């Protein structure tokens, strides 16, 4: 099994993949 810090851990990595911002930000739009 994976650790409990997997969620927060994937957040740091996913951050690079994102580059922009959460999908929610797209809903609010500039």
Curated annotation (Swiss-Prot):
Cellular localisation: Cell membrane
Q: Which residues cross the membrane?
A: 9-29
Q: Which residues are in coiled coils?
A: none
What protein family does this chain belong to?
Belongs to the fungal Na(+)/H(+) exchanger family.
Chain's role: Sodium export from cell, takes up external protons in exchange for internal sodium ions. Involved in regulation of pH.
Which named protein is this? Na(+)/H(+) antiporter
Annotated gene: nhe1
Q: Where the shown chain sits in the full protein?
A: 125 to 154 of 468
């Amino acid at each position: 099994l994976f650790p409990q810090i997997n969620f927060l851990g994937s957040l740091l990595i996913a951050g690079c993949i994102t580059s922009t911002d959460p999908v929610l930000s797209a809903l609010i739009v500039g």
